[PDB]
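Q: Hi! New to this. If I give you a protein sequence and the SMILES for magnesium ion, can you show me the bound structure?
A: Yes, paste them in.
Q: Okay, here:
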Amino acid sequence: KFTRSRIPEKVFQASPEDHEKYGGDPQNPHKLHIVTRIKSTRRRPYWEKDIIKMLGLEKAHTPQVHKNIPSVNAKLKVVKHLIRIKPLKLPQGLPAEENMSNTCLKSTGELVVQWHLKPV
Amino acid sequence: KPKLRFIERAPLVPKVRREPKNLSDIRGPSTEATEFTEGNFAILALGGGYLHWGHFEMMRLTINRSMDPKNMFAIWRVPAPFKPITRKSVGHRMGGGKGAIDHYVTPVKAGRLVVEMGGRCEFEEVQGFLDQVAHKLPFAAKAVSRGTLEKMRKDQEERERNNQNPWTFERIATANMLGIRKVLSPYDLTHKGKYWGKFYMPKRV
Amino acid sequence: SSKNLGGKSSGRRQGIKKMEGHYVHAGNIIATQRHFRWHPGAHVGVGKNKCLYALEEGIVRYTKEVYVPHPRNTEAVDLITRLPKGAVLYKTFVHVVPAKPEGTFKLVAML
Amino acid sequence: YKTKPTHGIGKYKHLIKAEVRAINLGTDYEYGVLNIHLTAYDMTLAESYAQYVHNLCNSLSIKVEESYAMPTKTIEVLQLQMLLDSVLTTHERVVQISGLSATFAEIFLEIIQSSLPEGVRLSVKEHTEED
Amino acid sequence: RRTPPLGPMPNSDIDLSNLERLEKYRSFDRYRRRAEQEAQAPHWWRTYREYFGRTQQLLERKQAIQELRANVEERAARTASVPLDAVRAEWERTCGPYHKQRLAEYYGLYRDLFHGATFVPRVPLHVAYAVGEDDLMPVYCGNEVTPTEAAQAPEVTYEAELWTLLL
RNA sequence: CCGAGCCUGGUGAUAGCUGGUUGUCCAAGAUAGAAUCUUAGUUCAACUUUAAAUUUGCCCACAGAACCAAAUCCCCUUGUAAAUUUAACUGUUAGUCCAAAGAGGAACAGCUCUUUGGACACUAGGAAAAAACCUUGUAGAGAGAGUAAAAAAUUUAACACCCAUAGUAGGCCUAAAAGCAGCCACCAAUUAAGAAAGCGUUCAAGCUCAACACCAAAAAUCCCAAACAUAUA
RNA sequence: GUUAACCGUGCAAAGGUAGCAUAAUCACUUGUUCCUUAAAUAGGGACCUGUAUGAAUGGCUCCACGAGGGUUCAGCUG
RNA sequence: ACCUCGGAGCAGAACCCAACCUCCGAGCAGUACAUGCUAAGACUUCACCAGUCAAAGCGAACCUCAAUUGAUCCAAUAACUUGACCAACGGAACAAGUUACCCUAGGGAUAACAGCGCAAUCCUAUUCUAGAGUCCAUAUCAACAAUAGGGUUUACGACCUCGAUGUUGGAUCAGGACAUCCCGAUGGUGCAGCCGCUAUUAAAGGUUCGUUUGUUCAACGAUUAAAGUCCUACGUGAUCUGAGUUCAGACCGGAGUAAUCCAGGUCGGUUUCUAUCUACUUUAUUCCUCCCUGUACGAAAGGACAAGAGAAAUAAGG
RNA sequence: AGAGUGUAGCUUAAAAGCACCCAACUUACACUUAGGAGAUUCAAUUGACGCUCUGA
RNA sequence: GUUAAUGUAGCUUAAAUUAUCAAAGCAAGGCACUGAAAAUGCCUAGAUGAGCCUCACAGCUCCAUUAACACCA
Ligand SMILES: [Mg+2]
Ligand SMILES: [Mg+2]
Ligand SMILES: [Mg+2]
Ligand SMILES: [Mg+2]
Ligand SMILES: [Mg+2]
Ligand SMILES: [Mg+2]
Ligand SMILES: [Mg+2]
Ligand SMILES: [Mg+2]
Ligand SMILES: [Mg+2]
Ligand SMILES: [Mg+2]
Ligand SMILES: [Mg+2]
Ligand SMILES: [Mg+2]
Ligand SMILES: [Mg+2]
Ligand SMILES: [Mg+2]
Ligand SMILES: [Mg+2]
Ligand SMILES: [Mg+2]
Ligand SMILES: [Mg+2]
Ligand SMILES: [Mg+2]
Ligand SMILES: [Mg+2]
Ligand SMILES: [Mg+2]
Ligand SMILES: [Mg+2]
Ligand SMILES: [Mg+2]
Ligand SMILES: [Mg+2]
Ligand SMILES: [Mg+2]
Ligand SMILES: [Mg+2]
Ligand SMILES: [Mg+2]
Ligand SMILES: [Mg+2]
Ligand SMILES: [Mg+2]
Ligand SMILES: [Mg+2]
Ligand SMILES: [Mg+2]
Ligand SMILES: [Mg+2]
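A: Thanks. Here is the predicted structure of the protein with magnesium ion bound:
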């Protein structure tokens, strides 16, 4: 029977060479994920069909921000293949009320809070 | 006694309930006898398969007619055939349940030793008629020694450490990295990526 | 030929009807079984078909506990008198922790 | 969830039981089933010694199976010297044994000889019979 | 799937190969005793209990029992009486305190009077209410006496030596 | 046109069966079963629709479910917004393949039978054409742009050169068995040659070797794209 | 049981009689043998296990006869 | 063969889960007679109907089993109650044969012919040396087995066709494969020669006439260089034959009371089309006689190659 | 002579729980009912008696 | 291939369990001897392996054997 896959938790562990591979570090984890769907939910079972709808990834290549809590991480751990996770790193902090109007995404996952259309 | 005894077809206590062909008995590695005991050299089985009574007569003839009973001796590792095979009469449609019991087989998995031999010789003495009998078994089989079996296991282990390819079967299938468990089997979490169906793929790490 | 027949019995639909943690009101059925699986613990009765009906309203629990049979149960005392010296049986049991207290005292008259 | 990590909290199969000669290389016999024979012209003294033998086996933790009794013979006095007539019958009790320690044997036998009663024939041997 | 066991399993230190040489309970009241022992172990799995929870005196005793064992000729073995007033007069001195603490704890006196923090009453208090003129109905540690008998103050004795009393 | 004439009438006989069922547009929409002279059908359930009222539905974590593997159930947090109930209904209930656990059969079938999950009956690209595989879904215009899936790799067997005398036709057993019919033993001459490893003899006898020495493819109309090893992923 | 005339043994209402025969007559069958042919699963004449022949469900021969169905000598003719 | 009910496996750990799937069982018995009355709450054989369990109370002491069954209407009796192996077991209150004299509605949902899938069965090639072959595994044959390939048999499947895909042999014309019968070239031989056996390569060309049978087949007579294996809708019926098989008649034996029925046999039995489209419609082999000669070979018997010359015969074109 | 030391047969018992015995049933054993026998080697953490071990 | 039927003294039949009667065979008793007639006796794993009970017995597992069925294109 093809059943629901349950992943052992020794896969979700980072060896120290991975901290050289990707820039993240266990001290100071990122607080927010950016999830983008990169696979269709068709030819995939109904639980994955509704977990994508729960996470709000209906349109592929559309970014959503999400909490780095273990409950949401567990929902991601059944659709870890259909998605693409990048940690939302912030050079400047969260936007203020006068700074909400001019922001953008800037893939490589850097939510800049001052977006001008002018070169450097 | 230094000779393989007569193994009897159709066991003297017969079977009266017709068992289904429980097809786990060919798949994967063996939990049964994979090791040597009171011997030196043997037959390794590189793939699953049933054994009729014909192969039993073939082995009992092809080792005894080419072995000198003053120097070498031989023991089975497999039992007499116990699993019944049900065969209908020929020319019948589908329907009506299973037919009568026809014959009896014994199942051997991969890696289970079949015929073990020892005595006051060396592996090159036995290997001749051993590759004679080994090609006629109904799967891929091989002649092995206690030394060469260990050296082969060292090669199969060293290939697990030598590969530069970062994606093994065990990194992917245990994690279900592509959702590939939809395509794979549940037995590919434990057999490994080596076994496929009946055959055993030895070159695949 | 089909010398076999008769095996057209349906499924019994017996099992746990109320898993651990559920709030169970009085008289509800907890489990149904043949060939005993769970034994009754506190405030759990047993029907003639070995049903485990709940007696008092509360939350159901499941505990392993040591099994001391009835002495006139001649079926298992022969097991008891053949157990070795370090042996304790540990059957499993279903309980209910009762939720509502049996009654409070209410001021009705001033006399 | 469960089979699960309280699996086998209760299993009355491996604990309880189910359902020759002790070969025992080197420590040669470590004996199998011996039948020890208490025969007497009394019934009661042989029965008393059978009870005592049984309690001695249960005291020294040797295992026994059966304390059965062969059919009691009837012999008159042999009418051999006037010819003389009096019926004195021989009763028989037989206590089985199953196990033994080999080095222990002589102590158990010595206590049987030392405690052996009056007019009672002791005989150990092996088995083939029926009541 | 098979999760590993956390604590040491029961019946794990007895299952040998030689099970014909084990002790093997022949009774039922051996097994019931060894089973009702097991209601007290902490038991890592799950319990019912979790959800529902000098030398001179010795020599005098060994002399006095030696006297009483030989004096009765054992004639009244195959119908004694054991005089209860004497038994109570000795029990109130010796193990009355050890038993009235149990009555206090089953009534939950310490979780009401002292918020816990038990104590052993070393002084017995003979208190008796005046029923008419005679008799006096004594109050023990857990008795039942109605508010009719307790209309007037009772008689208190204790056989001790500066005190204060509270009802 | 006779297994029972023809014509009128009952008669628009009836038909669980076949065929047909005529404007535009848009939205929701898929098959657990149980009975049944029933399996070409219908009724109820499931699914679906619509309108409503009302509140939780999914996803889930420690704990938890039995003695004789994948997994499941229960399940707060958590991400989400559907669910239950009432009212009114029809239609499907003659289904395929793929993967997985199986069963029957030949461990045959584009075979039959259940279960978990897909897709298919629904558009689009790809695997040549293609229902079912892989990519992908909510729609229009564009003579914009980045992507997804997406192109089979293999070519394989050389080999030693030389030297050879003897106790001895080793004992036994055999018409005869002499290294070689079968048994027992397997020492010993020189440097080095086995009481012989294949021959070859009726037995012998001759050749050698061992030792010194020397340094994979076959079927029936006509093969089947064309081709192409080297300017920078 | 001695291919048996013969013997034993049941059952039955009676145990297929005369005939006739590999037939228009289950199968074994292109049965065996003689004639016909250079060569005959065809035709004629005999042999009977016909093991499912048979007596007015008529049986067996035979004279004439047949747009019957198979066999044939001789001629003869694309 | 089965039709209903229950337990176990498939269905390994909530539940469910098919089968003309594997194994067992049931159509009861026994003991009390409070096997009394009422009443919260639940479960439930995937609907319903049915079933199940049951605290409190009233009244009294002080049921085992797994299944062990049957609804409504009805028949009784004054009532309570009781009635089917209605076992086609959710039950029509009581109804069997045969149709080839058949008819109608349909179905490729469903069979025969054919196609297709498979390769159990079949055929061939290998691998392996057991054994034959006087010795000798391999000139030749081959057991126990193993791996691939073929799609000619007998099957099985039921995917196209039932608002028709006409069938067995034969005639006519053949096309292709090569797994070659001969003719050609080689290798080996337990090959002296003549003969043969076998392996590789070769598909240019050809592969007879009859008696019997519907016959493909098979048997047999006479031949020849040889009288090949197949496939092509078991090639080809808008080219033909209908003798079989395959309608209505009829007999004989058998089954059946009868109607009737028979891979059991036998006589008889309408075989349609005026061509719309595609396609199409003129391009040498072999045998034998002679000679070589009775030479090579063998001891003879017997007996050739290659070289030469001559005659035919069929095919093609005139 | 030195050393380990010291509760009735056993005790991570502190006057105990087990062990043990004799009747009654049981062929016996057992189960059970009845009954039974019992100990901190000797004086204020130390001392001298009891075994055991290490000795000549 | 499927159902159905049968298993006997030595041969056949029987008997609702238990097991007969009739030939065959074994002795005998009569005329010179057989035969015949009789009389004694003998001969049954009731074709299979268990016993649920107790089994020709009543259900298997059987192992032999016997008929019907092997179908109107
Ligand atoms: Mg079932
Ligand atoms: Mg079912
Ligand atoms: Mg109509
Ligand atoms: Mg219908
Ligand atoms: Mg829509
Ligand atoms: Mg019906
Ligand atoms: Mg299919
Ligand atoms: Mg030589
Ligand atoms: Mg005939
Ligand atoms: Mg003719
Ligand atoms: Mg339900
Ligand atoms: Mg009550
Ligand atoms: Mg029904
Ligand atoms: Mg007719
Ligand atoms: Mg007619
Ligand atoms: Mg019609
Ligand atoms: Mg079809
Ligand atoms: Mg169809
Ligand atoms: Mg077909
Ligand atoms: Mg040979
Ligand atoms: Mg189908
Ligand atoms: Mg048709
Ligand atoms: Mg048409
Ligand atoms: Mg060729
Ligand atoms: Mg002709
Ligand atoms: Mg002709
Ligand atoms: Mg045709
Ligand atoms: Mg025509
Ligand atoms: Mg045509
Ligand atoms: Mg005519
Ligand atoms: Mg056209």
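A: Helices of chain B lie at 53-64, 123-135, 146-162, 169-173. Let me know if you'd like me to explain how to read the tokens.
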